[PDB]
């Protein structure tokens, strides 16, 4: 035979390499007198409708733990948080000697000195600060703010909101995002019906140390995710399949009044504190909770050698690395989650689990990486309905086994919602042989 | 090319060659009616890489059009494979994996063929 087949260029051939870029965020039409941190001063463009294309008979390899979509969005979320903060206020005059002892949650009663809007006339200020934004520096005790070693705290500038609206990540021209769309998908290895899309599903940029909130649901399985299950240090993500309810309230009137500290600097703070004065709680129905934790330990037995699973509590210590960070109305709860994670399975109610929550104003929300924030209390009784959806479990190093609930890195919080995706580069100029003689 | 700034979309990647060329054409048909520093930076380099790949279609006489046939002897050292062998038993990504050790040489040879073709009609 001869078969003198020749060259042919194709523009538009479907060809991809597992490459990388910077993505751009893209919300829905909501965004104008709204200045929340996440999707206002960062990404104008709104996507009205999806164009997702299925891919037939292809098997694409996914590896979320060496993904840098999530590390790139983590960097955009830190830089986004900060370029939404620095034009706010900057309360440099609170690092003083603080005259604090309680008066009728026993947070404390604290007066100190300030400066008023005039510099020579001076200001004495009343306040109510919490036990954990305070350190004992050495009745009528004398304390300090927790963040006067490191960087100066700013205020939230309350016209800023913090509602975690769905941020999409749409890829620029050139690149496509390959969603998995496989059920019981582990986040590692192949994927069967990987379909291409131009932007992700709307992820909510929530922050929560101990367990995940408002997540997307897996449908059929509950999914155990880690980088290295033999390595006890790596944080195990547990993704549910049913939306566990939680209601977090502070059932307490606490009014917000302001001081003139600078020109245009009006520090908002607590005032009178009445209502149902006890620690802010979160309630969890024991039926769904112990059912989903039973199915969680069923699947963890399916991973961990079919062993005897105990759920110890946390290791204690610093209540931000250790406890349950929470993102209610401009206020930040740390809920001692101890009676949620305490079992040994190899016998609780169908009633209600109630967990206390020490709340916090001045947050170093991300552990050194980023900047601080004063969170002003809003006006009083606050109810935020939430769907607890994830768990973050770290097995320990000791015929038993343990899932001590600790967090880990912060980008972990989004790896439950970016397992399915993969930024991919298109090289569209393919050179295939056929029989032409033209051009 | 199918994007906000215009660049091809992966129409039916898992489809084998004989259907995928048809869907490349239907890609075209639907694609053109379907048509803070991070966004600007990304789409500027999208412009740059687009004008790059249209200059590759420019310097092969293909003028920025699909299915542009040119006159090169496709060497059996680049591939000894028969037509229907690859064009009914394969998809496009694994064939680009096959010949990724030749693409610079193919761009080389198509450029000598295009300058040779225009210099010969420059004579004639």
């Amino acid at each position, epitope marked *: 035979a001869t078969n003198n087949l020749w060259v042919t260029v194709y523009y538009g051939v479907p060809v991809w*390499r*597992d490459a990388d870029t910077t993505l751009f965020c893209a919300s829905d039409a909501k965004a104008t007198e709204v200045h929340n941190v996440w999707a206002t001063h960062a990404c104008v463009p709104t996507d009205p409708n999806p164009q997702e294309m299925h891919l037939k008979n292809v*098997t694409e*390899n996914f*590896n979320m*733990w*060496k993904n840098n979509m999530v590390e790139q969005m983590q960097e955009d979320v830190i830089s986004l948080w900060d370029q939404s903060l620095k034009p706010c206020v900057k309360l440099t005059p609170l690092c003083v000697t603080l005259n604090c002892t309680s008066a009728t949650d026993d947070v404390r009663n604290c007066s100190f000195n300030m400066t008023t809007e005039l510099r020579d006339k001076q200001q004495k200020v009343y306040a109510l600060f919490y036990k954990l934004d305070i350190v004992p520096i050495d009745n009528f005790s004398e304390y300090r703010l927790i963040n006067c070693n490191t960087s100066v705290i700013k205020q939230a500038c309350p016209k800023v909101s913090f509602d975690p609206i769905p941020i999409h990540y749409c890829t620029p021209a050139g690149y496509a995002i390959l969603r998995c769309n496989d059920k019981k998908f*582990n986040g*590692t*290895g*192949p994927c069967k019906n990987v379909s291409s899309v131009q932007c992700t599903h709307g992820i909510k940029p929530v922050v929560s140390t101990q367990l995940l909130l408002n997540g997307s649901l897996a449908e059929e399985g509950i999914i155990i995710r880690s*980088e*290295n*299950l*033999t390595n006890n240090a790596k944080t195990i993500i547990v993704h549910f399949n049913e939306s566990v309810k939680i209601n977090c309230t502070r059932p307490s009137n606490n009014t917000r009044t302001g001081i003139h500290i600078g020109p245009g600097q009006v520090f908002y703070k607590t005032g009178d504190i009445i209502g149902d004065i006890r620690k802010a709680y979160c309630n969890i129905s024991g039926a769904q909770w112990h059912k989903v934790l039973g199915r969680v330990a069923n699947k963890l037995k399916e*991973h*961990f*050698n079919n*062993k005897t699973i105990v759920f110890k509590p946390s290791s204690g210590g610093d209540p931000e690395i250790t406890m349950h960070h929470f993102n209610c109305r401009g206020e930040f709860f740390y809920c001692n989650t101890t009676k949620l994670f305490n079992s040994t399975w190899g016998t609780r109610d169908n009633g209600t689990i109630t967990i206390p929550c020490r709340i916090k104003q001045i947050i170093n929300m991300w552990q050194g990486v980023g900047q601080a924030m004063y969170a002003p209390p809003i006006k009083g009784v606050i109810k935020c309905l939430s769907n607890i959806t994830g768990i973050l479990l770290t*097995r320990d190093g000791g015929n038993n*086994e343990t899932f001590r609930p600790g967090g880990g890195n912060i980008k972990d919080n989004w790896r439950n919602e970016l397992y399915k995706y993969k930024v991919v580069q298109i090289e569209p100029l393919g050179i295939a042989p056929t029989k032409c003689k033209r051009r | 090319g199918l994007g906000a700034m215009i660049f091809g979309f992966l129409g039916a990647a898992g489809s084998t060659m004989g259907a995928a060329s048809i869907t490349l054409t239907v890609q075209a048909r639907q694609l053109l009616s379907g048509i803070g520093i991070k966004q600007l930076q990304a789409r500027v380099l999208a412009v740059e890489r687009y004008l790059q790949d249209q200059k590759f279609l420019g310097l092969w006489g293909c003028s920025g059009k699909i299915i542009c046939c040119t006159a090169v002897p496709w060497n*059996s*050292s*680049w*591939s*000894n*494979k028969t037509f229907e062998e690859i064009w009914n038993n394969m998809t496009w*990504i*694994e064939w680009e*994996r*096959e*010949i*990724s*050790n030749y693409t610079s040489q193919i761009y080389d040879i198509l450029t000598i063929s295009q300058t040779q073709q225009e210099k010969n009609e420059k004579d004639l």
Partner: antibody
Amino acid sequence: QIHLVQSGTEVKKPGSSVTVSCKAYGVNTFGLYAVNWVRQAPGQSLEYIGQIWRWKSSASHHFRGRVLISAVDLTGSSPPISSLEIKNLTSDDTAVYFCTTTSTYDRWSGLHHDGVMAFSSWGQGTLISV
Amino acid sequence: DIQMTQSPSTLSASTGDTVRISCRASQSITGNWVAWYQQRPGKAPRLLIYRGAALLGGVPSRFRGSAAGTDFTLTIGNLQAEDFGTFYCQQYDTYPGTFGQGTKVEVK
């Protein structure tokens, strides 16, 4: 980095069955990595046997229906471990056996091609005499 | 359906030298899909060449693979003493992957 070990050196009876482990200290899974089972007769060159590759167990036509391979990936106490098992060890099966993982994530690296692949990181080879 | 051969079959040299092995297949694979190995006898193989001329991160820079059609080459310039042993060639295009018959490298 990646490292491989397996079972020791086992000498058995003709007409027995043998199993050889494969502990992959470094494989993040065997979903995306793939492992390969390769014999080597004494002095004679190495001969391929089988593989696992995205959980499709395969062996050669020289070994179909007699030899069976398994793999369980990363659990807690265990690294990802595969295992080669042979019934009816003839005198021909007197050989040195090998398990090797290959990275099959970045598809254009060229260590792999559509099921067959270049074998990245070897173990220690196991003598089996009959 | 491949029974590969390579040239040579047994070769010796010394340190600081330059040396050549090629392997030839019955077919003519196009996409450079070859891989070459070495071992000292009693140890395991070490992948040094995948896909013609791509080296690993850890294989020394002195090795060089090369491609010509069916005959694919590896050259060692400035040979070091801990490089002796048996080499092996590999096609990995049509399943199953059949290998080379080995080449011992020693000192005369």
